[PDB]
């Protein structure tokens, strides 16, 4: 009956708040202080939260969701029936929790050392080398070295991780873990929807690829770049070649129109990692959206500590399911790239504050992609020359194509990589890719989608996916692909609401209450309604669409077509078999 069902939801909500609150603190202390004490406290708080999940998930399965009128009640109960890892028998649950902890630690503490000297960490050392070095062999030292230490050591944990995470999914009614992850979007046509979105950005990516390949051919020499083959994976300014903005000096369309060194501008004018978040806080409030509580500033780790303690550096935002406690954990470097990431993480916090009045089971994004997109939308406005100049970090047709090129190196280059990652994982989860095919099938997709090849031939024992944070940390990736598509849809819609006329890329939504109002009401929905409703609240239409992204970059697509045609470039990589000598 309906009456017992709403009572159960109320009971679940109160008990979840307390137990979810306790787990968050226990997880925080490990993430901000990797030791042995905090690790086993987390392993024991894992059993406490699993008891709650098992207890209430059993009760939920005794409810026939099928016989329930109120859809909000119907929705929550259906979610509680999913136990996740808690569905596993005790021995396998503790094994699975240990493996995850082992993988997360292995990744976070891994270092790449010189013959008998300095040992380098991923952030900021190896990140800095990948971004600034222009020597082929030095970049290779960092690229290979990171994969030799982080990737290779993850390989031992991964098959059993796949086995146990799939087992949990089967016990919760799914065929495998990929199926379980995809269900978060509540869209039966998701795979075909994502494929069509990817195909629509092919002409824009292939033109950026061909142009960047030409620029690399210019600098690294004809012997190391094949203008009809895939680009060596280590030359794009980033460890995973997911974003390419750091090789801007190598690709700048009009060097005739030069732009400020934005990193040294920040360091000189006295930009603290604290001021970087303070300015991101200002942008949100200018839209009429909520400020971060005083408690946020007291308890957040906005900078890498000098204790000598190990930490999880990857940027993340933290909801304590309290309605009062919200935190950010980030190893912030003072540069433009981390200012964007600071806005991204503040977007998560805003989403937390907007739906804190909802039940905890519904305290979630419309879909995971929505949660990632909020900060990135504001960052698009922050990234404009007009907003950056007003922050004294910069000082028109040539500057216009340059800016669009800068944005393309991040936004466009990430489309194929963000698509790639879960294309690999889903096939790993469903059995298409086994442990003897992990690395081979990873590079097949690197070639197929990104048009990248490894700089060094891959050997047995290589597990390059393990050198990317999200893989050993078991964090789904397709969200970022959705985010990059939809953030431009949000941008377009918020700019038309702001009354911005002219080219989309010159829009700055700063201080627009109309743009804030559309964001607010959509975020307030949380996970109460299917995402097409939240999409419609912001954009006036319910579909994911690549139109807004192509509109934004339309001036660049025309310029690239002309430029690549006059060089007689071949779009794509007809010689997919090509690897370096
Ligand atoms: C199914 O059950 C759900 C949850 O019990 C009902 O949703 C609730 O609906 C009421 C309005 O009927 C919402 O109350 C509102 O609160 C705000 C306070 O900020 C106030 O300004 C409004 O005037 C209103 O009173 C309440 O938020 C909402 N709760 C949730 C969790 O969504 C729903 O009405 C039920 N559906 C049917 C068809 O009976
Ligand atoms: Cl890789
Ligand atoms: Cl996701
Ligand atoms: Zn995020």
Numbering used by the authors: 40 to 434, 439 to 624
Publication passage describing the model:
The E403R mutation was generated to investigate a proposed chloride channel, where Glu403 may act as an ionic gate mediating access of chloride to the chloride 2 pocket. For the E403R mutation, the Glu was converted to an Arg, corresponding to Arg381 in the N-domain. The E403R mutation is in a highly accessible solvent area, and thus the longer side chain presented lower stability. Furthermore, whereas Glu403 made a salt bridge with Lys118, mutation to Arg403 resulted in local disorder with a higher B factor seen for Lys118. E403R also presented less contact with the surrounding residues by the loss of several hydrogen bonds with Ala400, Leu401, and Arg402. No water molecule was seen interacting with the mutated residue despite its solvent accessibility, and overall, no conformational change of the main carbon chain was visible. The E403R mutation significantly reduced Kd(app) for chloride binding with both HHL and Z-FHL relative to the C-domain. Thus, E403R and the N-domain lack this stabilizing salt bridge and show lower Kd(app) values for chloride binding, suggesting that the chloride pocket is in a conformation that can more readily coordinate chloride. The salt bridge serves to reduce the affinity of chloride within the chloride 2 pocket of C-domain as well as affect the structural architecture of the S2 pocket.
